[PDB]
Symmetry: D2
């Protein structure tokens, strides 16, 4: 049966999560996106936005609009291949969404204004049954990372959960292979050369929550603390309090890369780690962790759906020779694409794990 989904806040990620569904072919098939919900309800504008993307190209499916009722000014309904997505009027209080009336049970919370466990739980009153925050949450919300711990998901306990962050979903799969393969992680420090995002600015402007982040983004290397490496602990309890790291926001519109440096728990070799990474990318991490041994550069990872793309050649070429513990692993990720697909995955995995618990 179709999954009645409702996307909250049809922004950059909102549109990427939706386009994820389509790409994978889950529209009007496995997932029923009953309604999206951003600032306005100008379906014609929503069409244009989905249709054209500066970095990800032109949407592969044709988009069109229509009215939900002949008594409407501008088209208020989006049409993607027979399926009809409604654009409802945004809200300030999730508890005031027509989710119940619309028939939505799973909402993807991607506004960015409801990452608080209880704030997102407002969608439940609205009539939804499960919510997935497309970012790190707070309030004891369960954090799940596909291919790492999504199986810990519990249908009767977890109703508001987080898919975590783009960087966490990129780092986690590497730390996970390391620990599961027995290499271990004593202590680790990571840096992420990250492409600027919507939170940043075009020219120097006011940003009281992050002074460096208000500076002209496309012409600066902006440092920033991140809780991504420390969030790995939530997903891999064994590495709790053992990792941390920063981020250097740099002048590229999309795609980033993880720079991990850690000390293995036991003696090994970089060749050994390299081989363990590739082996899992083809097995238990397939579709989540991938790798490459080609001389690629950020642009080559655009539209890659893996959560983490290990860079074999950058890794094998920049470590200490004969070193048995102090290592560096490099991995790429399209911050927008990969994560967006993981959002659909987590949601799907939940619906299936929710079905079973019932019928």
């Amino acid at each position: 049966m179709p999954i009645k989904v409702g996307i909250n806040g049809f922004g950059r990620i909102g549109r990427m999560v939706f386009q994820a569904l389509c790409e994978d072919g889950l529209l009007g098939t496995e997932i029923d996106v009953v309604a999206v919900v951003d600032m306005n309800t100008d379906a014609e504008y929503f069409a244009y936005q989905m249709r054209y993307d500066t970095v990800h190209g032109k949407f592969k499916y044709e988009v069109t609009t229509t009215k939900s009722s002949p008594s409407v000014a501008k088209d208020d309904t989006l049409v993607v291949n027979g399926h009809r997505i409604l654009c409802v009027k945004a809200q300030r209080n999730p508890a005031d969404l027509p989710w119940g009336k619309l028939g939505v049970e799973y909402v993807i919370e991607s506004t960015g204004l409801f990452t608080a466990k209880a704030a997102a739980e407002g969608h439940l009153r609205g009539g939804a049954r499960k919510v997935v925050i497309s970012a790190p949450a707070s309030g004891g919300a369960k954090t799940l990372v596909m291919g790492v711990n999504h199986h810990e998901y519990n249908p009767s306990e977890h109703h508001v959960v987080s898919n975590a962050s783009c960087t966490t979903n990129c780092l986690a799969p590497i730390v996970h292979v390391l620990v599961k393969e027995g290499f271990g992680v004593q202590t680790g420090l990571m840096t992420t050369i990250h492409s600027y995002t919507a939170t940043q600015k075009t020219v120097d402007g006011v940003s009281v929550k992050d002074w460096r982040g208000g500076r002209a983004a496309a012409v600066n290397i902006i440092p920033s603390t991140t809780g991504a490496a420390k969030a790995v602990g939530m997903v891999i309890p064994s590495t709790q309090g053992k990792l941390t790291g920063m981020s250097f926001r740099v002048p590229t519109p999309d795609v980033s890369v993880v720079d991990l440096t850690f000390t293995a728990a036991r003696d090994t070799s970089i060749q050994e780690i390299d081989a363990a990474l590739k082996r899992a990318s083809k097995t238990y991490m397939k579709g989540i962790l991938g790798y490459t041994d080609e001389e690629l550069v950020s642009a080559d990872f655009i539209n890659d759906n893996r959560s983490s793309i290990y860079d074999s050649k950058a890794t094998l070429q920049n470590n200490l020779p004969k070193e048995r513990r102090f290592f560096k692993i490099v991995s790429w990720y399209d911050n927008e694409w990969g994560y967006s697909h993981r959002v659909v995955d987590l949601v799907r995995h939940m619906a299936s794990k929710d079905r079973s618990a019932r019928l």
Copy 2:
């Protein structure tokens, strides 16, 4: 006696205006900046923004902070070499600004949200006498452009004037020399290759009133309609209805260039015009109109304070040989820097004219 000034909206232009004041040694002499206003009153953060500038480099003059009164939580007063400046809390409604209790009579309206004669008049009700809008205004506000029509200022008839746009300010100087030297302007279409600004988005974001204006700002040549060229009709009435243009927002944090095409009212030559422009920049347009004959690029115009820098070589080298009517005039400008010096130039003018009206 110095004139009490207050700057509403301390950003790109609010700050460059201040830096221009310090630079020309006017602070504490011709002008007494009583206070600035933005999001909060954290002087310490205001210092940081003033101290470091991504495009204009380190603020050459020292800046520290203190408290207006011990009963204040964090510092709220900026101190630039003895000159103290108060950081007031932003106001949703201009009429709610404590001007009359501060002593401020002139307020440079640069927040960007009160360009409507009616909405900007709120500064008068707050307790101020005059208000200069750092952008094209509406509502009847008299529009003045230094070196072109700024003498049409009526001390008693104008209380909320518009210093025009940055572009109008680069164009006017030229169209004035043409009209004044008798070259005349039959018809003209301008195109400004404008570097992006704060109203643009780092990544494809929401922008309902200007769709293309929402697409990624540092990786796209974004077209846009502009009033700048038309506005030249308000400063030089004989051109009203003869010009109009557009803007292409390209990937540069500062400095723009006007590409003016037009047909003269009489038979002339690009040489005659070239020589007319340089001659003018050395005479009646000195300070306002500048010009170069060197192989310059945008960065070379960074921090140039003129309103228009005629590019001799670009013009002469790219026109039709022997033509006597159809010409192209290229002229650069630091959309941030010069225009800011003009805002100060304008206020100063208004001050003298207001001092000589009742005296």
Copy 3:
């Protein structure tokens, strides 16, 4: 009847011309690439450059490499979809290439160092029949433009042609409609906001041939002269010495746009001109001239094979109202994609005519 082609200068445009063939399913079938050529003969590196592209995405046809004789040090054969290409050794003189023995009659000269009639003719002495200069030629080389004058090709007269400049291929299609649709062009100046190219520098460098051209490309707006507006006269004589213009190289890796300002021979409106362009694009200029009525930006025209894409909105919205002679036309173009496609088009047309020319 696989046409015989030999690409000399397998670089930015050389590779694009190749990916141009494949895209149209002409490889092996209509056209047969015997052997390409650049500095080295490393097929692994060639294959790599082909597989991944920063602006145009990933190559859609698997590429592998083999040998032609085990006596070779590294793979020197480029197998693209079953069809195999040979990587010949670069020469300082076009006449030194084994075109004769290689059995290569047509040779797409895209090195950019032999835009001279005689120079490129070195290809004919090496054993080749026809030589197309994927760039503006000089020395009495017939310049053709698909959809504007390409039929002027004399199979038995023109053995060396010039497919003109990427800019002329965008302007001409536009001017061609104006002249033919009876609008006429009295005088015109054209400016092109062009994105940087391989001839520029990453950081300030030496460029004695073009001082401005030797300045940090990705952070400046470099002015530049151009002969594309003047070259139209060689393709549309009616305009001889009636058009010219410049270039403005901005910070973008690909896609450029024309901004033609001109006066019509007779009276009209922007509507009539807009209507003619949309008409011509759907009829006698289809495939060459296209148009858009959407809020598009630079990146949206990435991979557009048309030569000129007229921007309806940007044109109707930025001209003088009720005006009858002075006009501005805004037209886009993927300076890399479209052009490359025209190169193949001219090559296939020359074959079609060469064939029947004696058969």
Copy 4:
């Protein structure tokens, strides 16, 4: 008797060395630039390159040109603030240089073509006394990093030395304070988020010795194996085989930052370290090592002339709380400016030393 220096290879770096040299106010007084040597002799084009800079702003001193002898075709003399500098015609062999005749004892190697000890020795036979290669050198040439080991300069032993690279001059000061202050370095991996350089390309082009380095510079994050780290084992032998790292070339014209990670040789805290670096910057590292505790971004380091600017905030905030061995240190540097000044520093040092050993 001011030192007679001659610059070999007046390129991006030859200038920076001369501009830095002028900045310190040494031209004519302490040092005396006799003549510079570059491919071309065009002095008007040299004065241009010296007059304006895309990143470092405009040269503060006046630059004009003349002729050394009335019997000279074009200008061959570059006159900087009164001081006279001759522009000798370049060469491919360091021997064919008239250093001795020119009376040049100290020549600065920035051509980037003679980084070899044996090769660069030509100057010596060219009558030139000593040679400072402004880049990593081979052939077992002595490396010297100002503030780290420049005191290992033996006049009668070293006549052709290397000033190491820009990155090493950033890492060395940091590692030197760590080793000399008791912390020690057991193992360490560095990463430099580096801005693109001249060796990179605007758009995807041919780069056989570095494939990723051939990709478009201002639109990608290009990884790269680096030596700087390992080259530290030459300046601080004790770390021989203990360090290494890579590089991420990001979209910025200038300014880079070093992100070093390592395990101390004893127990400490990120505070002890932080204090030790600040103490050193104020004492024995003054001028070479500097630090900041403000919220800085790359643009804020433009024109800083220290070799390493430690980022106190970025460091203290991104290390594991209570950690004792595994640490991250973030340090900035104007990869162009700092190094340039160091080159002058090494030369000034050598001089004084040579004066006392000879006198």
